[PDB]
Amino acid sequence: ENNCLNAAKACNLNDTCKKYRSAYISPCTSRVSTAEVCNKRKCHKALRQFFDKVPPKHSYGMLYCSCPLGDQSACSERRRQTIVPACSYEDKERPNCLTLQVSCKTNYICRSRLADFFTNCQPEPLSLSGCLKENYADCLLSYSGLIGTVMTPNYLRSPKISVSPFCDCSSSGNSKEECDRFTEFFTDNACLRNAIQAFGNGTG
Amino acid sequence: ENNCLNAAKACNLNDTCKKYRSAYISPCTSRVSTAEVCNKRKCHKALRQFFDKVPPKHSYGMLYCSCPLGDQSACSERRRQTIVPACSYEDKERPNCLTLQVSCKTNYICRSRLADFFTNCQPEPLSLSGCLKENYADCLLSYSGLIGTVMTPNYLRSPKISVSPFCDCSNSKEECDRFTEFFTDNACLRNAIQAFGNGTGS
Amino acid sequence: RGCLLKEIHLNVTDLDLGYRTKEELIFRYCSGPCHDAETNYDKILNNLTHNKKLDKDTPSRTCCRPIAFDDDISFLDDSLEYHTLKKHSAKKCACV
Amino acid sequence: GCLLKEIHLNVTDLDLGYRTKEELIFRYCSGPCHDAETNYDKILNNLTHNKKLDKDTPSRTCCRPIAFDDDISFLDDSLEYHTLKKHSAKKCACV
Amino acid sequence: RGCLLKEIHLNVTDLDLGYRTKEELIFRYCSGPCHDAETNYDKILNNLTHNKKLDKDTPSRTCCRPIAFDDDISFLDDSLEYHTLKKHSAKKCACV
Amino acid sequence: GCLLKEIHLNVTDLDLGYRTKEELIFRYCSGPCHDAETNYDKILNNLTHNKKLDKDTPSRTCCRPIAFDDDISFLDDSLEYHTLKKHSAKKCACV
Numbered sequence: 003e004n005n006c007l008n009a010a011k012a013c014n015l016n017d018t019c020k021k022y023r024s025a026y027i028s029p030c031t032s033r034v035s036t037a038e039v040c041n042k043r044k045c046h047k048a049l050r051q052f053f054d055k056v057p058p059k060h061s062y063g064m065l066y067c068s069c070p071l072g073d074q075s076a077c078s079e080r081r082r083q084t085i086v087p088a089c090s091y092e093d094k095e096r097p098n099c100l101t102l103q104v105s106c107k108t109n110y111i112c113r114s115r116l117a118d119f120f121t122n123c124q125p126e127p128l129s130l131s132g133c134l135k136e137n138y139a140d141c142l143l144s145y146s147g148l149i150g151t152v153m154t155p156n157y158l159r160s161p162k163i164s165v166s167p168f169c170d171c172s173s174s175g176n177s178k179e180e181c182d183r184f185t186e187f188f189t190d191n192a193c194l195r196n197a198i199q200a201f202g203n204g205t206g
Numbered sequence: 207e208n209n210c211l212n213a214a215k216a217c218n219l220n221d222t223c224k225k226y227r228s229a230y231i232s233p234c235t236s237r238v239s240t241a242e243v244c245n246k247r248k249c250h251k252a253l254r255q256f257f258d259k260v261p262p263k264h265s266y267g268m269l270y271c272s273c274p275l276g277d278q279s280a281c282s283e284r285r286r287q288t289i290v291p292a293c294s295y296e297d298k299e300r301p302n303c304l305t306l307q308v309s310c311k312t313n314y315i316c317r318s319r320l321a322d323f324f325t326n327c328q329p330e331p332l333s334l335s336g337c338l339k340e341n342y343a344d345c346l347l348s349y350s351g352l353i354g355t356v357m358t359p360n361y362l363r364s365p366k367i368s369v370s371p372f373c374d375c376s377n378s379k380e381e382c383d384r385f386t387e388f389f390t391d392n393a394c395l396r397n398a399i400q401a402f403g404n405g406t407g408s
Numbered sequence: 409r410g411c412l413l414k415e416i417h418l419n420v421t422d423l424d425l426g427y428r429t430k431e432e433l434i435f436r437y438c439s440g441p442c443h444d445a446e447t448n449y450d451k452i453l454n455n456l457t458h459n460k461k462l463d464k465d466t467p468s469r470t471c472c473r474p475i476a477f478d479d480d481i482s483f484l485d486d487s488l489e490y491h492t493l494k495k496h497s498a499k500k501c502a503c504v
Numbered sequence: 505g506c507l508l509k510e511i512h513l514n515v516t517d518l519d520l521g522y523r524t525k526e527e528l529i530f531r532y533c534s535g536p537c538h539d540a541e542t543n544y545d546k547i548l549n550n551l552t553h554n555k556k557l558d559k560d561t562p563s564r565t566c567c568r569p570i571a572f573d574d575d576i577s578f579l580d581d582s583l584e585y586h587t588l589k590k591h592s593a594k595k596c597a598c599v
Numbered sequence: 600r601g602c603l604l605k606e607i608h609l610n611v612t613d614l615d616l617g618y619r620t621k622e623e624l625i626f627r628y629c630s631g632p633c634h635d636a637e638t639n640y641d642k643i644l645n646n647l648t649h650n651k652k653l654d655k656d657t658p659s660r661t662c663c664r665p666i667a668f669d670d671d672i673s674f675l676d677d678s679l680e681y682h683t684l685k686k687h688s689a690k691k692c693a694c695v
Numbered sequence: 696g697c698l699l700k701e702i703h704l705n706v707t708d709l710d711l712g713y714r715t716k717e718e719l720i721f722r723y724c725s726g727p728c729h730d731a732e733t734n735y736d737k738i739l740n741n742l743t744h745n746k747k748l749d750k751d752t753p754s755r756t757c758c759r760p761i762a763f764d765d766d767i768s769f770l771d772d773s774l775e776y777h778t779l780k781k782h783s784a785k786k787c788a789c790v
């Protein structure tokens with residue numbers, strides 16, 4: 003019925019995927035206090051471990067599952083819950099994107115992934131593919147490399163595919179323009195959108 | 207209240223920021239002898255540690271806190287003492303800027319931190335942001351990365367926002383005037399510091 | 409060598425554990441004869457029970473049970489809520 | 505629940521074919537193992553109720569011995585010695 | 600249980616230690632009943648005091664006190680001078 | 696300061712319900728721990744003075760035993776033996 007649900011079926015029937023899927027579900031869902039819903043550190047560490055050791059056919063087949071319209075469908079919601087956003091994505095405070103860029107750039111692994119993302123998922127309106135670098139695979143990996151980090155992205159509740167990190171541009175100051183360019187590279191990017199759709203097309 | 211005083215409050219209330227803030231205040235405030243005011247080497251090592259362990263919201267919120275732009279404002283004085291400049295910044299002899307560059311370039315870490323500073327904080331009068339590279343964050347980090355080296359910079363007492371290392375310029379001198387001007391009057395650096403303050407304040 | 413490990417493919421709802429989900433699973437269990445591993449203790453129990461020397465205590469003879477449980481499984485139900493099960497499948501069997 | 509019990513018997517009361525007047529003490533395991541229940545057990549109960557498993561009747565938790573008692577030796581009527589091993593329980597546990 | 604750590608938000612001036620600053624802090628202390636952890640030594644002390652066997656001394660019984668002190672805290676005063684405090688808050692408690 | 700004191704007594708001077716004519720030597724801790732107070736103690740006094748900690752009444756330094764003496768046994772009138780443990784102090788310290 004739903005390509006996104008068939009991806010889970012294939013995962014639980016695969017010993018390697020089944021093991022590591024549960025490995026990240028439990029920490030991201032096991033409460034530790036009335037205030038804390040999870041050990042966010044241990045949750046992210048299992049996510050990264052999931053995409054490292056689970057084969058890509060199964061791991062990415064669940065993250066990029068093809069959905070008719072990713073807005074308010076069962077296919078769209080199952081995909082939104084893949085990273086357990088209640089623990090890995092959301093937070094009590096929404097930071098400014100300048101502060102979130104500083105925090106990511108202090109950490110070496112986060113910096114490298116963020117730099118690879120903006121380089122490999124650069125759009126080009128004059129391109130049939132939409133990507134300036136003309137390689138969907140390189141853009142998908144760079145994006146996935148941000149999952150477990152401080153820049154964790156997740157699908158937004160929109161008609162078409164829209165992803166974002168947990169940051170905002172509340173400042174009315176002149177910095178609003180540079181902040182808008184950062185979020186727009188995530189939210190409205192025809193290269194990333196074509197890559198995600200292109201991968202689900204293949205594993206369908 | 208001052209955005210700087212509120213930042214210090216938010217630090218003491220955060221266990222991580224409180225611990226490491228005290229970790230660098232003590233060595234920079236502990237006198238080893240009547241001649242030496244502190245173990246400068248241990249003071250710098252604790253500063254760098256403070257910027258590596260404390261989350262940026264607090265560490266950089268105190269350093270780049272927003273002031274009212276009043277000359278010798280309480281915030282500005284509080285912000286100026288952030289690094290304990292009596293131990294890390296000041297020194298008995300003010301070196302010539304050519305010699306200080308030779309010292310920073312002998313140490314691999316200071317050399318890279320300096321190269322990253324000039325590359326990422328290049329100004330551009332044509333750019334609306336003021337930065338040639340168009341990334342404020344990359345300029346703020348490259349700057350802070352110097353706070354624990356021989357090239358440690360700190361705010362100067364001016365009506366505007368001015369930062370400088372402990373150096374002075376006096377055959378050739380224009381190259382030395384270019385170096386000091388890169389810290390004192392850099393629209394890319396000034397606009398970044400006033401961007402973080404706008405974001406981490408109210 | 410008779411207590412073996414078998415496989416069965418099922419819905420999660422086939423386990424009747426109260427969940428409403430369309431996820432699937434591979435269930436593994438132990439089944440086989442343990443006549444080769446019986447001891448004097450077992451054949452004594454068989455005879456004593458026949459003689460009725462034991463007052464209806466009906467002690468248990470060798471069993472074909474698991475000695476190692478399988479990895480945990482997690483699934484997502486129809487309400488978009490995650491669940492996880494532990495000690496559900498068998499990884500290694502043995503006549504215990 | 506799974507506990508160890510004792511009984512005083514003759515080597516003949518075990519009906520192992522021996523002819524002797526010697527005696528023994530036999531220890532066995534008996535008790536309930538509901539406290540040691542696992543999902544694997546429950547899944548087996550729900551599958552046997554239905555007919556998913558085909559004529560397999562797998563076994564749930566058993567109360568069995570985890571350690572056997574020391575060996576025992578006796579002399580029969582024909583002046584011949586016999587020795588029995590792993591015949592009595594030393595320690596029980598739900599398995 | 601009983602002996603437990605409790606927290607409070609205070610100005611640095613609320614501690615009344617003589618400092619002049621507007622900074623703030625979080626203070627943790629131990630408080631709770633330690634009746635459950637009394638030894639025969641404590642009972643004897645209570646019976647000796649009641650019967651006035653120990654004529655004058657007033658020995659102490661179990662106390663709910665900190666067994667671990669909190670990290671150090673530093674603040675800036677109105678005169679642009681730095682002060683640091685050690686052993687100001689409790690990190691762990693115990694009936695001892 | 697916090698020092699150890701000795702006091703000779705009967706076994707019935709402890710009012711523990713025992714019946715015997717035996718005797719004991721009891722050691723307890725008593726002394727001032729003022730010279731071992733910390734900022735934590737000074738803060739508590741100042742907060743209890745201005746009454747910022749209205750409800751609670753936390754404890755300051757206590758001269759307490761850190762090691763208990765050896766065990767003591769005795770015989771009662773009914774020719775029954777009794778043993779006490781952790782009844783006297785061996786070494787003290789400010790806690």
Ligand SMILES: *[C@@H]1O[C@H](CO[C@@H]2O[C@@H](C)[C@@H](O)[C@@H](O)[C@@H]2O)[C@@H](O[C@@H]2O[C@H](CO)[C@@H](O)[C@H](O)[C@H]2NC(C)=O)[C@H](O)[C@H]1NC(C)=O
Pocket residue numbers: 417418419432
């Ligand atoms: C997993 O479940 C599917 C679906 O269950 C079927 O539909 C339910 C509403 C209920 O009626 C169940 O009893 C059904 O078994 C199973 O696939 C179906 O199996 C039936 C029985 O042979 C068959 O008639 C259907 O065509 C199948 N497909 C459907 C309903 O879409 C399947 O056997 C279960 N086990 C697995 C997947 O291992």
Ligand SMILES: *[C@@H]1O[C@H](CO)[C@@H](O[C@@H]2O[C@H](CO)[C@@H](O)[C@H](O)[C@H]2NC(C)=O)[C@H](O)[C@H]1NC(C)=O
Pocket residue numbers: 512513514527
């Ligand atoms: C061993 O067998 C003898 C029988 O040969 C058992 O002794 C009998 O016990 C019953 C019950 O007390 C008596 O009514 C019989 O008279 C006994 N027979 C003899 C010959 O004495 C004996 O109990 C058995 N051993 C044990 C441990 O039970």
Ligand SMILES: *[C@@H]1O[C@H](CO)[C@@H](O)[C@H](O)[C@H]1NC(C)=O
Pocket residue numbers: 173174175176177178397398400401402404
């Ligand atoms: C910060 O805010 C002030 C007040 O609105 C504004 O004038 C200034 O340009 C802002 N600086 C930035 C966003 O860098």
Ligand SMILES: *[C@@H]1O[C@H](CO)[C@@H](O)[C@H](O)[C@H]1NC(C)=O
Pocket residue numbers: 608609610
């Ligand atoms: C801190 O200081 C202010 C000003 O004196 C006072 O009103 C407040 O009660 C103090 N404590 C807290 C927790 O704010």
Ligand SMILES: *[C@@H]1O[C@H](CO)[C@@H](O)[C@H](O)[C@H]1NC(C)=O
Pocket residue numbers: 703704705
């Ligand atoms: C011990 O008991 C006797 C009475 O039996 C009493 O006189 C004596 O005082 C007791 N011991 C001490 C130390 O008082």
